[PDB]
Amino acid sequence: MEIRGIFGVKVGMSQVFTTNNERLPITVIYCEPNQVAGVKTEAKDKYSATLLSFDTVENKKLNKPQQGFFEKNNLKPTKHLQEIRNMTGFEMGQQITPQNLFQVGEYVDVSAISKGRGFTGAIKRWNFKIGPLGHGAGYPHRFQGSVQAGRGGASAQRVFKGKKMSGHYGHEKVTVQNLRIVGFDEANMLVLVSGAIAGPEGGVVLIRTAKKKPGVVKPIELAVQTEKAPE
Amino acid sequence: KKINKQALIDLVEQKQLKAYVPEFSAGDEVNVAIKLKEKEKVRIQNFTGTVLRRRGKGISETFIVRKTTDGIPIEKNFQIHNPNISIELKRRGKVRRAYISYMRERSGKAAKIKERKQ
Amino acid sequence: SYINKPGKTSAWRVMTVRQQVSAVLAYGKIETTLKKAKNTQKRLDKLITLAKVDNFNNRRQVKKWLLNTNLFDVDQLMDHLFSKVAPKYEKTPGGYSRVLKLGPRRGDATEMAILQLTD
Amino acid sequence: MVSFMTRLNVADNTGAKQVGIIKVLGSTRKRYAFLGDVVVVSVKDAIPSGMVKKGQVLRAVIVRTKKGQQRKDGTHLKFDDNACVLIKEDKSPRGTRIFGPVARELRERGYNKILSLAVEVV
Amino acid sequence: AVQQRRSSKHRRDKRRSHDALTAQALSVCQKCGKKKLFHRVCSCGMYGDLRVKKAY
RNA sequence: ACCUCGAUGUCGACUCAUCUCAUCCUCGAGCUGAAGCAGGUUCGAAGGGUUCGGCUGUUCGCCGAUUAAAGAGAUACGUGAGUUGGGUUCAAACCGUCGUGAGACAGGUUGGUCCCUAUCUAUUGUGCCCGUAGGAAGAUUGAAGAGUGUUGCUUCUAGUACGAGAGGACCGAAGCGAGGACACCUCUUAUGCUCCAGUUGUAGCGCCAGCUGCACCGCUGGGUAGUAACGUGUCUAUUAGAUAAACGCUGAAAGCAUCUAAGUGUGAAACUAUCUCAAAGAUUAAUCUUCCCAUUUCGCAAGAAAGUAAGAGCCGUCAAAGACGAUGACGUUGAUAGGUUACAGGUGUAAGCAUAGUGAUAUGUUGAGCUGAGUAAUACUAAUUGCUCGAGGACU
RNA sequence: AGCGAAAUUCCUAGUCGGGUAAAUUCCGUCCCGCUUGAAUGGUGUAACCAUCUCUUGACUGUCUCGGCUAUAGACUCGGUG
RNA sequence: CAAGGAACUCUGCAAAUUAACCCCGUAAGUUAGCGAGAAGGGGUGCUUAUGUAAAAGUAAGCCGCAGUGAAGAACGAGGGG
Ligand SMILES: [K+]
Ligand SMILES: [Mg+2]
Ligand SMILES: [Mg+2]
Ligand SMILES: [Mg+2]
Ligand SMILES: [Mg+2]
Ligand SMILES: [Mg+2]
Ligand SMILES: [Mg+2]
Ligand SMILES: [Mg+2]
Ligand SMILES: [Mg+2]
Ligand SMILES: [Mg+2]
Ligand SMILES: [Mg+2]
Ligand SMILES: [Mg+2]
Ligand SMILES: [Mg+2]
Ligand SMILES: [Mg+2]
Ligand SMILES: [Mg+2]
Ligand SMILES: [Mg+2]
Ligand SMILES: [Mg+2]
Ligand SMILES: [Mg+2]
Ligand SMILES: [Mg+2]
Ligand SMILES: [Mg+2]
Ligand SMILES: [Mg+2]
Ligand SMILES: [Mg+2]
Ligand SMILES: [Mg+2]
Ligand SMILES: [Mg+2]
Ligand SMILES: [Mg+2]
Ligand SMILES: [Mg+2]
Ligand SMILES: [Mg+2]
Ligand SMILES: [Mg+2]
Ligand SMILES: [Mg+2]
Ligand SMILES: [Mg+2]
Ligand SMILES: [Mg+2]
Ligand SMILES: [Mg+2]
Ligand SMILES: [Mg+2]
Ligand SMILES: [Mg+2]
Ligand SMILES: [Mg+2]
Ligand SMILES: [Mg+2]
Ligand SMILES: [Mg+2]
Ligand SMILES: [Mg+2]
Ligand SMILES: [Mg+2]
Ligand SMILES: [Mg+2]
Ligand SMILES: [Mg+2]
Ligand SMILES: [Mg+2]
Ligand SMILES: [Mg+2]
Ligand SMILES: [Mg+2]
Ligand SMILES: [Mg+2]
Ligand SMILES: [Mg+2]
Ligand SMILES: [Mg+2]
Ligand SMILES: [Mg+2]
Ligand SMILES: [Mg+2]
Ligand SMILES: [Mg+2]
Ligand SMILES: [Mg+2]
Ligand SMILES: [Mg+2]
Ligand SMILES: [Mg+2]
Ligand SMILES: [Mg+2]
Ligand SMILES: [Mg+2]
Ligand SMILES: [Mg+2]
Ligand SMILES: [Zn+2]
């Protein structure tokens, strides 16, 4: 469908009080003006997408093939390049900011790389139960759980593919859907998004149109303090 | 393109901070007027009591107020920079800590804080 | 497994830093492991910058770190620090000490490091 | 958060000094009961001049919690003891008075009689 | 648990295929010429232009 | 009595579950001795769910309170190189009973050692080498896949349909939840062993004051960053296609009738997609963009001697990462780490002095002092002036 | 005689009462005690028990339900093996 | 280790509460010896003064969330075999 996408960097989390008496936790995203580096058409390519360039950097910090591509396309040198599917209607070499893309309070989804956690066990990874601690116990307390499917020639006799055991956790792309934009800050180029965004502070963040609610925009307005100077 | 994250968070918080934000220490008695909203109008409900803690930096500044009604002690956590909430410092008291937790263990004549502070 | 060695406890780590910093202030060079020099450097720099005013409060602060050495006592190390070493670093914006890597030990292959006062 | 087999006090005039939770009514494996939740209970400490007798299984609604809960504005309501009042099918209190303060979460889940018979709502 | 079948002399070498050693990077000192492993003080105590330790 | 007595550990419980349908709930439909509500039976359907306790070693079972429901089985009556040993079944002891006796009882009771460092394969993660036919740096399509799929209550529709009445809807809409899942630390909490403060004993700094070592971090009250839930955000929708049961419209064989044979429909949480993740070692090795190779001689050409670049690696500083590799940032043309400076947050008015008191101590300087990781600047220190690998693309 | 569903009762999770929201265990009682019983002793009994069994107050990570921190391992490097 | 406090399990196994000294108070039963440290409670720091051979204690004042401020000190009640 008509999917709109922007890229930014998560800077932290705060809260804002709103009319109708709710305290809304928000995530703050620093969104640089993104530059459309390429447009790929359905007829000529077999699919349609828009690839932008963001997180600008000086030319001496970029490799020779990438700077050659940037100077060939007459674009600002950036070290980050990525595309979003089904993004159409933007001319090559046009600066795009979230103000032109999304509305004041429309629903969007956000994709980001999760915070790395390393080699974690079965309980912390698959929400497994811990074995009993008292009334007599054994060496394996944080046991993963018996992986027996069948013992004997007439049964599996093997661990089934895709079993739930210990392994790497974190540093993986994850998407949280139906997040309402709260406010735009043009001067600081700063986007406010309700809820919590995955990833460490300072990581890359992709804001896209929500596929569950594409055109739904729920109104939200902030509260103006009525307090006055001390008497 | 250097990003001072703390500064940007501060700007978002300043958008909705209050002007006065009266001060109070740990052991202080304040009057908190809750602007409860029904279908119509507002009923200003007072929650006068004793402060126990004031933590936070900006829009996330919170404080704890302890009250006692009919011998039942109730503790309530308010946000300072929250609309429809008005704080009025009544008595300034002397304490030797920032989180006076013993107030939720000591009661009666032993729950009275001497005045004065510096 | 039980009856294990006490180990690299937090108290042991603080005492190790105290001993190395006292020695490096007394002699001027320390030949230790690289990972221990990289931890003693912080305390060395902190002691030197706090000993730049030479008031009795600063003596009380330093005395919680200094230890007795062969070449100086705990009271003559005080005179050496506040009158000889620290006055030299009067307008240097930090970085009074340098850590450089020597070769590996014959019996451990751990990376040695010399910690010195950067003139 | 009052849970299964939790002893709590009764804030009404009915002769029941200590009451024990049996089931957190409302769904399957409902772990906890927050303010305004209805539970099935058994009277364990009662008095001779009381409407209820020791051992009866009855239905109650909680009004206070030691753990407390947080409202939408950000205020965290926290009492110092878990208390419940005995209610009837119609959602009407069994006692004629309510002792101490009660929360505002009752107002959302009906319980208008409980609020009108309380000393002061919070 | 123990091997119910003996491992041949071929599986052993296949596992050891990753046990090979690597040659540490070396450089030339700028005041005496002998080879020293990179980013470390030479045998004369002369690192760059700074006299670090007394000569061996 | 076919395998196993040169050993196949046997009940129950815990953890992890998977599969089948003869379906407990949710979903669709036919008949009803189906007015409505609630039922009974049959057909289709396995996507998800299918509670906590008292007594007993118990499976089973009875009982209590809930739920939409508390399904039937299989997997060595799954699961002890995963846990336990309550039960059975060692040696000890007693009761009832049998025996003249030593002893015996699917009779009862008390007590009573559960070993193994994983070689192969299976599986969860992460790497090196090589291939993808010039090399390298980027961005993609997606063959074959994996993950989730639960449901309740209230209000309105509407006291309308139906029904003497009592009672009480189908369809549809909104709000609030329980369980499960993903992510995060603004709020509330837990932790926070080189943080702050209070404080006891003892030994030291020659003594007072002030600190240090030890006593669970000595103890106690708080607590930065980080890690987490008990916390708060989101999901657990929707739609399209082909259908099962079932219902069809038009229609003959069989002038009627008839859902079917031709043609044309409707139709379920099942199936294929829509949602999330990963994916060209997919050797069937894909596509696009950019960059670098395009020498002198000898002869032998995907030949030699030298000779030509993009890039990568070794080494160093590291943490958005992390067992180790790897991932990502930087290496003087630099803010990568430490130090310094300023600040935030935390702790709670520092030492010294002066006053007051006989003294413990209080008051003023003083929202003072201190501070591990946090925020940002600053080359002061450490990332040296180094080494290695690496290209002309056969022909059709 | 005394005691009795008992360290004894097969039928049997015997009947009834008490304890619990709910009690094959526990306490009292009833007695067709298949097969109790008087020095292989019978019935009571104050004190005592690293004895067995049941109810209960405080108490707590036993548990709902798992989470954080520090060491020694495990993991990486060098030596023996 | 927040809320709950045996819901865990064959069983409160293990862990947790109490713990030293001084001052009050202490039941049923009994072989009159016991039960009994029963149960249940309170105080503990520092300074000044009074007390003594030394104390203990007594009175006033001061500080802290907490004063055998850390170490070492009994969990209890009831019924039965
Ligand atoms: K056999
Ligand atoms: Mg063992
Ligand atoms: Mg253990
Ligand atoms: Mg076969
Ligand atoms: Mg097989
Ligand atoms: Mg210690
Ligand atoms: Mg060989
Ligand atoms: Mg090897
Ligand atoms: Mg035969
Ligand atoms: Mg066989
Ligand atoms: Mg054999
Ligand atoms: Mg065997
Ligand atoms: Mg075995
Ligand atoms: Mg069927
Ligand atoms: Mg499906
Ligand atoms: Mg019980
Ligand atoms: Mg069988
Ligand atoms: Mg079995
Ligand atoms: Mg089974
Ligand atoms: Mg059989
Ligand atoms: Mg097994
Ligand atoms: Mg087993
Ligand atoms: Mg074992
Ligand atoms: Mg086995
Ligand atoms: Mg046994
Ligand atoms: Mg045993
Ligand atoms: Mg025997
Ligand atoms: Mg005989
Ligand atoms: Mg495949
Ligand atoms: Mg915070
Ligand atoms: Mg002293
Ligand atoms: Mg017809
Ligand atoms: Mg269809
Ligand atoms: Mg081939
Ligand atoms: Mg830094
Ligand atoms: Mg002072
Ligand atoms: Mg007789
Ligand atoms: Mg009798
Ligand atoms: Mg018995
Ligand atoms: Mg009975
Ligand atoms: Mg038993
Ligand atoms: Mg009896
Ligand atoms: Mg006789
Ligand atoms: Mg006999
Ligand atoms: Mg005889
Ligand atoms: Mg007898
Ligand atoms: Mg004994
Ligand atoms: Mg070690
Ligand atoms: Mg080794
Ligand atoms: Mg707890
Ligand atoms: Mg509690
Ligand atoms: Mg139980
Ligand atoms: Mg159980
Ligand atoms: Mg014990
Ligand atoms: Mg007694
Ligand atoms: Mg008896
Ligand atoms: Zn040299």
Tab-separated table of C-alpha atoms in Angstrom, chain A residues 22 80 82 124 181 209:
chain	number	residue	atom	x	y	z
A	22	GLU	CA	-3.454	11.041	30.966
A	80	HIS	CA	23.747	4.911	5.934
A	82	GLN	CA	18.379	1.752	3.251
A	124	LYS	CA	15.513	-15.897	30.342
A	181	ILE	CA	2.947	10.349	17.073
A	209	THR	CA	3.020	3.737	8.388
